[PDB]
Amino acid sequence: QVQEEISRMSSKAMLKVQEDIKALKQLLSVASSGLQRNALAIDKLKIETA
């Protein structure tokens, strides 16, 4: 009976997590590129103001 219960516990979320994480890595990378670009805008505007 416990054997069948373990068979019934069959897992699908653990499949969803890895996808979520692989997506969140790219999300952090998108924010990273965005801050990288805004940094140079900051540098140029600071140059003009100076």
Partner 1 sequence: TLHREMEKVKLDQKRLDQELDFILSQQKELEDLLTPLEESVKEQSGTIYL
Partner 2 sequence: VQIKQLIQNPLSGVDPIIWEQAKVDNPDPERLIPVPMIGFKELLRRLEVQDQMTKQHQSRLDIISEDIGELQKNQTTTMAKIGQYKRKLMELSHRVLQVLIKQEIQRKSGFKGRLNELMSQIRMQNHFGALREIKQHLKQQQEGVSHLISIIKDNHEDIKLIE
Which positions touch partner 2 (CB under 8 A)? 2-3, 5-6, 9, 11, 13-14, 16-17, 20-21, 24, 27-28, 30-31, 34-35, 38, 41-42, 44-45, 48-49
Q: SS3 for the chain, per residue? A: CHHHHHHHCCCCHHHHHHHHHHHHHHHHHHHHHHHHHHHHHHHHHHHHHC
Token digits of residue 20: 């979520």
Binding mask 1-20 for partner 1 (x = CB under 8 A): --------------------
Q: Does 42 bind partner 1 (CB under 8 A)?
A: yes
